[PDB]
From a paper:
In Pseudomonas aeruginosa, an important opportunistic pathogen that causes numerous acute and chronic infections, the hybrid two-component system (TCS) regulates the swarming ability and biofilm formation with a multistep phospho­relay, and consists of hybrid-sensor histidine kinase (HK), histidine-containing phospho­transfer protein (Hpt) and response regulator (RR). In this work, two crystal structures of HptB and the receiver domain of HK PA1611 (PA1611REC) of P. aeruginosa have been determined in order to elucidate their interactions for the transfer of the phospho­ryl group.
The recombinant PA1611REC protein comprises amino acids 507–651 of hybrid sensor histidine kinase PA1611 and contains the C-terminal receiver domain. In this (β/α)5 motif, the five-stranded parallel β-sheets, which are β1 (Glu516–Val520), β2 (Arg540–Val544), β3 (Ala561–Asp565), β4 (Ile591–Thr595) and β5 (Asp613–Ala616), are folded in the central core. The surface electrostatic potential around the active-site cleft of PA1611REC is highly negatively charged and suitable to accommodate metal ions [Fig. 7(a)]. The divalent magnesium ion (Mg2+) from the crystallization solution was found to be coordinated in the active-site cleft. The results suggest that our PA1611REC is in an inactivated form; there might be conformational changes that occur in the side chain of Thr595 and Tyr614 after phospho­rylation, similar to the residue substitutions in E. coli CheY and TMY.
Residue numbers in the entry: 513 to 634
The structure:
């Protein structure tokens, strides 16, 4: 039916907007809203890619990404950070966690399309 994307996003409107962009591109989307849920979803299913928002409740993007990279198949899954502060706080935290790439919010549907193809076809 389509490639499987884990979208890790805590903000309700970004959840709506980014899930809609992904479903418009033909992806199957699993949405989770915090780092704890990201680590469990990744432990239990192979995803084609994970979109990891940097700032999350419970467990942040840095910690979730570290924990996924320590799992047997999270070791290799493409993880693309979503950053709204690619300019300071996130460069000095989330973006050092083991990301393949990052999107800067606010981003375009075409940018999302471009970055997923880059990694799912890498
Ligand atoms: Mg956030």
């Amino acid at each position: 039916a389509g490639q499987e994307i884990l979208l890790v996003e805590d903000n309700p409107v970004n959840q709506t907007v980014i899930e809609a962009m992904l479903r418009s591109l033909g992806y199957r989307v699993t949405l989770v809203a915090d780092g704890i849920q990201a680590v469990r979803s990744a432990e239990r299913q192979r995803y084609d890619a994970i979109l990891m928002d940097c700032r999350l409740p419970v467990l942040d993007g840095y910690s979730a990404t570290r924990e996924i990279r320590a799992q047997e198949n999270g070791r290799r899954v493409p993880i693309i950070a979503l950053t709204a502060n690619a300019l300071q706080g996130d460069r000095e935290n989330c973006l050092q966690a083991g990301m393949n790439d990052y999107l800067a919010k606010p981003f375009k549907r075409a940018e999302l399309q471009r970055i997923l193809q880059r990694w799912i076809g890498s």
